[PDB]
Design an enzyme around this catalytic site. Structure first.
Site, PDB file in Angstrom:
ATOM      1  N   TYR A  16       0.854  -1.174   0.000  1.00  0.00           N
ATOM      2  CA  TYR A  16       0.000   0.000   0.000  1.00  0.00           C
ATOM      3  C   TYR A  16       0.900   1.237   0.000  1.00  0.00           C
ATOM      4  CZ  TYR A  16      -4.006   2.799   1.615  1.00  0.00           C
ATOM      5  OH  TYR A  16      -5.011   3.705   1.751  1.00  0.00           O
ATOM      6  N   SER A  39     -21.271  -4.239   1.932  1.00  0.00           N
ATOM      7  CA  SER A  39     -20.065  -3.692   2.554  1.00  0.00           C
ATOM      8  C   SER A  39     -20.381  -2.408   3.342  1.00  0.00           C
ATOM      9  CB  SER A  39     -19.002  -3.378   1.508  1.00  0.00           C
ATOM     10  OG  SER A  39     -19.363  -2.261   0.690  1.00  0.00           O
ATOM     11  N   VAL A  59     -19.062   0.608   3.117  1.00  0.00           N
ATOM     12  CA  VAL A  59     -19.234   1.698   2.165  1.00  0.00           C
ATOM     13  C   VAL A  59     -20.564   1.600   1.400  1.00  0.00           C
ATOM     14  CG1 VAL A  59     -18.385   2.744   0.035  1.00  0.00           C
ATOM     15  CG2 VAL A  59     -16.746   2.187   1.832  1.00  0.00           C
ATOM     16  N   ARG A  90     -24.086 -10.482  -3.353  1.00  0.00           N
ATOM     17  CA  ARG A  90     -24.000 -11.929  -3.499  1.00  0.00           C
ATOM     18  C   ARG A  90     -25.253 -12.590  -2.956  1.00  0.00           C
ATOM     19  NH1 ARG A  90     -17.675 -12.707  -1.597  1.00  0.00           N
ATOM     20  NH2 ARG A  90     -18.267 -10.846  -0.364  1.00  0.00           N
ATOM     21  N   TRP A  94      -9.566   7.177  -4.380  1.00  0.00           N
ATOM     22  CA  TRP A  94      -8.762   6.849  -3.203  1.00  0.00           C
ATOM     23  C   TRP A  94      -8.892   8.005  -2.232  1.00  0.00           C
ATOM     24  CZ3 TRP A  94      -2.647   6.578  -3.054  1.00  0.00           C
ATOM     25  CH2 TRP A  94      -2.246   5.935  -1.892  1.00  0.00           C
TER      26      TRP A  94
END
Lengths: 364, 364
Positions: free
Chosen positions: B57, B178, B180, B200, B300
């Site tokens: 990262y 998730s 987010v 999913r 990002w």
């Protein structure tokens, strides 16, 4: 709590340069259900252990902070003998007092103690159990601590690759006075395989020759005789008169020696290279491959048994049985007892330095 | 003097291998005029924290000897909630008792305490202050500890890039359940954006769909439906009948999922990729680029806000406001309390290993 000592390195290099001793604590009062604590009885120094520290052997333990270092570090040693001292509430396979070896490589055996899971270990009989089972001999510490590499290597090379007809067929090996070579001679005797051992000449040659023949070598020759154009036909006669064929060669030397043993195989022969005598590649003449249909292959016990529990188990059991029965003998190790008066890593550093004297076993 | 503990590494690697705990001292009697001591209340484990430790990262704190280690060491964790325990004489922006988060990444939040400057922190209202200011709710420790990455990420992707017409336009996102994803659904309800969440399939699909619709997703489809030729025209109808257009796709999965959501956009669509499901590149049909004027870009939050205090402030203030007013909800974290009976780094190691159970928050 238990205060243990472990020989670690944070960076690959020569053992004289990078090894150190780390003190760490094992909580014997907080075992998870499947966990086991063991105390080391003895662990040897093998070339593979040294190569591993050097960073030139492609099987190694991860570097971690789990021994209480700030720098990720790796343990050392791949075989050894331990005694179980405590087990978790769900362990049935092992019991306090049992002898064990690691079930896998990269466990780290150059240390005083270990905490693992029950399946990190393979039980061998302790002498009390062998005797209770009516066996004439219990295993020695050396026999247990060195059972995982060299004896299994000899046995598997001789039986797993080509079928030698008992009372007829031959194998040939170099490094005839090596540990593996000496096991191979005994196993050939036990299984009724004929063999030639090739050894380096020395002042007490005829004596060494008699000693190897007693172990089980049918014939013993020097490296000069292996090289010899004049001598070759004599070897052909031995094999011819026996009714069998020289089907398998075992090479731990390379160079001229490997060429020599390959030349002495019958057509359709197999060579297994399991070691190397520093820098020397395996050198084979083109003519052997083409006109004799010679094959050259490798043997690495670590890889062969990596995911073959059944083969390991069966082989191990045979070696244990033969030791209990007095039918197999180990070479004597030079044993150095860890006292607490000298740092543990220094004991193994000395052992690395004193390698040519003989097999070094650090005891506890 | 304060005895504190920090989770560090001196070498990149897996958290299970390279983390350790360092004790260190903070001088609370010797504060420089702008310095601030804080005490951690909680800090989460996020994928970027792990990837940072792993060395993959490209944003990370410097390794220094400032925690009292021999080797240079980096701290861990990028977000968290702290309580101010002391400030220097020139500090007017903070008081003992205040809640703060780091103003920048790479602060190191997996620790018990920290010394910094006042501009190393951003004030959040503590519960007492929120209630005193007349608001119906104060923030929870989990809400403050996790406010800086996922809520800002959802808010900014939805408002900072393409202007969605309230009451008409659509975004589509994968990774619907998730952290987010769930913020984005709520923000879409709050701002009056229509949305499709792709998720999913699971046995309790009925319950998850209802949960996501309550949060604010307009429609919820499975990945099988996202891939389905048969189902495709049904989605186009939702959008067409609304009078708006599907203008924005949020992608955190890659692969076929990214293909599927891209195909659901109208002409002139924009995809933002802000995450990936391991090794799955972003995969977009050529035809969308050429004939539908599709664009795919990245997001990002770390880079976007690095030198944009104004945008970070404005966004944070809105999320704080929504939490105070009860208009925003977090997903519940699995909380593990540090009490000194187990080394702090092992708490974080367990949290990393247990990441699949749900969001891990270490508390203090």
């Amino acid at each position: 709590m238990i205060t243990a000592q472990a020989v670690l390195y944070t960076q690959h290099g020569e053992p004289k340069d990078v090894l150190f001793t780390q003190s760490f604590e094992i909580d014997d009062d907080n075992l998870a259900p499947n966990e086991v604590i063991v105390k080391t009885l003895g662990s040897p120094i093998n070339p593979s252990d040294i190569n591993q520290i050097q960073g030139v052997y492609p099987s190694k333990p991860a570097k971690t902070t789990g021994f209480g270092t700030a720098e990720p570090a790796a343990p050392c040693g791949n075989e050894g003998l331990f005694e179980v001292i405590k087990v978790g509430s769900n362990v049935s396979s092992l019991e306090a007092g049992d002898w064990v070896i690691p079930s896998h490589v990269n466990f780290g055996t150059w240390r005083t103690h270990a905490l693992g899971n029950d399946d990190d270990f393979i039980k061998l009989p302790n002498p009390a159990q062998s005797k209770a089972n009516g066996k004439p001999n219990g295993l020695t510490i050396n026999q247990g601590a060195t059972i995982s590499v060299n004896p299994l290597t000899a046995y598997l090379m001789l039986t797993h690759y080509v079928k030698l007809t008992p009372g007829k067929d031959w194998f040939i090996q170099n490094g005839g006075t090596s540990a593996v070579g000496k096991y191979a001679s005994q196993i050939g005797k036990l299984l009724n395989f004929n063999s030639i051992s090739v050894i380096r000449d020395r002042p007490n040659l005829d004596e060494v020759v008699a000693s190897l023949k007693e172990l089980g070598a049918t014939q013993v020759i020097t490296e000069d005789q292996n090289n010899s154009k004049e001598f070759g036909p004599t070897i052909k006669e031995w094999i011819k008169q026996s009714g069998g064929e020289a089907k398998l060669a075992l090479n731990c030397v390379g160079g001229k020696s490997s060429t020599g043993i390959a030349r002495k195989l019958n057509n359709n022969g197999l060579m297994l290279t399991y070691g190397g005598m520093s820098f020397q590649p395996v050198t084979i003449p083109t003519s052997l491959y083409i006109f004799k249909n010679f094959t050259s292959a490798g043997f690495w016990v670590t890889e062969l048994l990596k995911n073959n529990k059944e083969l390991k188990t069966s082989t191990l059991n045979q070696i244990i049985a033969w030791y209990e029965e007095g039918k197999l003998t180990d070479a004597k190790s030079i044993e150095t007892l860890y006292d607490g008066t000298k740092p543990l890593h220094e004991l193994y550093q000395d052992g690395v330095a004193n390698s040519k004297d003989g097999k070094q076993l650090i005891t506890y």
